[PDB]
Design a protein around this ligand. Sequence first.
Ligand SMILES: CCN(CC)S(=O)(=O)c1ccc([C@@H]2CC(=O)N(C)C2)c(-c2ccc(OC)c(OC)c2)c1
Length: 125
Amino acid sequence: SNPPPPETSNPNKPKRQTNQLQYLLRVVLKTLWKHQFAWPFQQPVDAVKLNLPDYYKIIKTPMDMGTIKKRLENNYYWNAQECIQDFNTMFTNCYIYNKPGDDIVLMAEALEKLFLQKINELPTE
Ligand SMILES: CCN(CC)S(=O)(=O)c1ccc([C@@H]2CC(=O)N(C)C2)c(-c2ccc(OC)c(OC)c2)c1
């Protein structure tokens, strides 16, 4: 009924760090994960439990910080921009499904402000 969670490991990809990928795991993800508003985003949205039959009809690319965390831990991303896109998709999903001023949107907006501030200090290429 729920979609399978996104893949988080690539079986043939070499392990390669970059300055930016190290920053995204050790600074960006770590900071957001511990925030008091992180919990609704730490795992895929369970649209069954929340009685939202239309969520996965409206959201074509589900994404969440638990998936991002595993991807970074497993070195799934080839570059930092793929990871940044996953964060942006997560926030977009919230803003296109939920009503403005819903509590979950306020929580997303607080997390996104912290995300964008950290991205402003992303190491150079
Ligand atoms: C904690 C266990 N689970 C976590 C995924 S849960 O049961 O599925 C679950 C539990 C609670 C919430 C929020 C928190 C809050 O203040 N609400 C009014 C609902 C969400 C949720 C997250 C992101 C969304 O936007 C894309 C969203 O849109 C409906 C809902 C999910």
